[PDB]
Amino acid sequence: LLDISGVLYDSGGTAIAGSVEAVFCTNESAASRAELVGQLTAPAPAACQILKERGLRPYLLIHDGVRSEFDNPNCVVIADAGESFSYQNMNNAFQVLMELEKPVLISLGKGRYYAAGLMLDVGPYMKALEYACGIKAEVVGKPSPEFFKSALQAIGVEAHQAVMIGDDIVGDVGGAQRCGMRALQVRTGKFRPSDEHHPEVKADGYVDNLAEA
Amino acid sequence: SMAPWGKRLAGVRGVLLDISGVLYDSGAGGGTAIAGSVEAVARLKRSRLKVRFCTNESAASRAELVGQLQRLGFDISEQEVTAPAPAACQILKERGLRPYLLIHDGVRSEFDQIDTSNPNCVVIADAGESFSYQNMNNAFQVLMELEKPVLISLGKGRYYAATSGLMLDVGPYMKALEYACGIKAEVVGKPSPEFFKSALQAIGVEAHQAVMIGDDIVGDVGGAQRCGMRALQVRTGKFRPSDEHHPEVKADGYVDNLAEAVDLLLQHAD
Ligand SMILES: [Mg+2]
Ligand SMILES: [Mg+2]
């Protein structure tokens, strides 16, 4: 299983050297799959399924590029929204949640940041609403075990015979290991030196890039 | 039920007042007085009770805030207000800190005599519309390059009431950076004990003879009680009915508004 941002490419985007020739379980939510795949398993379709099953109608706190994936709100769906994380948009999501009988916040990933310099990801804004509303988000995407399992099922491979490759030490590496996989940390993308000596997560191996992997 | 109000308010010589949600609710064109609160302040000033405003207000400078309130009819001077910006400025000076200011323009004047150039920390306040992704990201990028990252937050409130509904305050954006950077903010303002103590010292009243009146069950009420004061929760401002049955904080009393609090104080307090 291959992470995309920080492994194949960095958005902005630009291919990481050696990664095109070296060649997917992604939390990408700024762009639809079609748009991402054009630029080159994702959380939006898995979210769509969960919404349908529960009669949930989302207020979408998202980037315009992923809106296609969701083609009287009773929950909020928050993604890697970037510039769309205006105060107006955040406040509107907040005010929706604060009027619900049963407030539900669905988050597409919980990454802290990604490399582009370093950029704030969905996670910090997820935490803002959790604190503001006094609720816990449901995370669809990595490191949720159902996300990894769906990606494994798509290729017909069990966890003990699979390896995840990623730049996010907790989200990718820790997450995959928790599901019974092996996992490798790349030193491209969001990687910082401390991630190789992380107090909680010891990757099964550390590699400079996808090519070395 | 509750102990008699006369027991509950016995010995109170001083009053710390929250502003937003207690005197007024902010909004476009200077906000709106809460009914009965202008006259309640007047009645307090006339009494022998000592009065201090203990506010986390950080969207506007004290001069601007005090101007807005005076224009609504309040009897209030800058000398009577304890607010976070000056306390933050003192701390920045004592530690050689130079802040990147994640703030509304209206409070920028408060930091006029601080060097923000070559910033070695971030100060986050109630920034409202200025919580753009760009500004949040810039603050984030400043913190991530620092050897020793320091985040100073002017309050940690979740939300406050405004004319346009409940609004996201400083706290949620504080929590965002804490998560993004992997650090804990230093909170200057309520409910930090030093903040309440500075306000008590300004009026020469000890905590066991003081009462805090506020709309924020954790920040105002829980905070004050943790410093040894009594505290009353108002039902105006950001108050929701679940706040009267809060699992952690049991206010010393609940009142509909400042007017009711003042009726009770002048009836039962010193
Ligand atoms: Mg990645
Ligand atoms: Mg208040």
Curated annotation (Swiss-Prot), chain B:
Matches recorded under SUPFAM superfamilies: HAD-like (SSF56784)
EC number(s) stated in the UniProt entry for this protein: 3.1.3.-, 3.6.1.1
Binding site for Mg(2+): D18, S20, D215
Top-rank taxon: Eukaryota
InterPro entries noted in UniProt: HAD-like_sf, HAD-SF_hydro_IIA, HAD_sf, LHPP/HDHD2
Pfam families to which the protein is assigned, alphabetical: Hydrolase_6 (PF13344), Hydrolase_like (PF13242)
Co-factor remark: Binds 1 Mg(2+) ion per subunit.
Positions with a binding annotation for substrate: D18, I19, S20, T55, N56, K190
Biological process (GO), any one: phosphate-containing compound metabolic process
Catalytic activity from the UniProt record: diphosphate + H2O = 2 phosphate + H(+)
One GO CC term, this protein: cytosol
Tissue specificity field: Expressed in brain, and at lower levels in liver and kidney. Detected in thyroid (at protein level). Expressed in liver, kidney and moderately in brain.
Keywords: Cytoplasm, Hydrolase, Magnesium, Metal-binding, Nucleus
Subcellular location: Cytoplasm; Nucleus
Cofactor annotation: Mg(2+)
NCBIfam families: HAD-SF-IIA (TIGR01460), HAD-SF-IIA-hyp3 (TIGR01458)
Subunit structure as annotated in this protein's UniProt entry: Homodimer.
Function: Phosphatase that hydrolyzes imidodiphosphate, 3-phosphohistidine and 6-phospholysine. Has broad substrate specificity and can also hydrolyze inorganic diphosphate, but with lower efficiency.
PANTHER family tied to this protein: 4-NITROPHENYLPHOSPHATASE-RELATED (PTHR19288), PHOSPHOLYSINE PHOSPHOHISTIDINE INORGANIC PYROPHOSPHATE PHOSPHATASE (PTHR19288:SF44)
Name this protein carries in UniProt: Phospholysine phosphohistidine inorganic pyrophosphate phosphatase
Species whose genome carries this gene: Homo sapiens (Human)
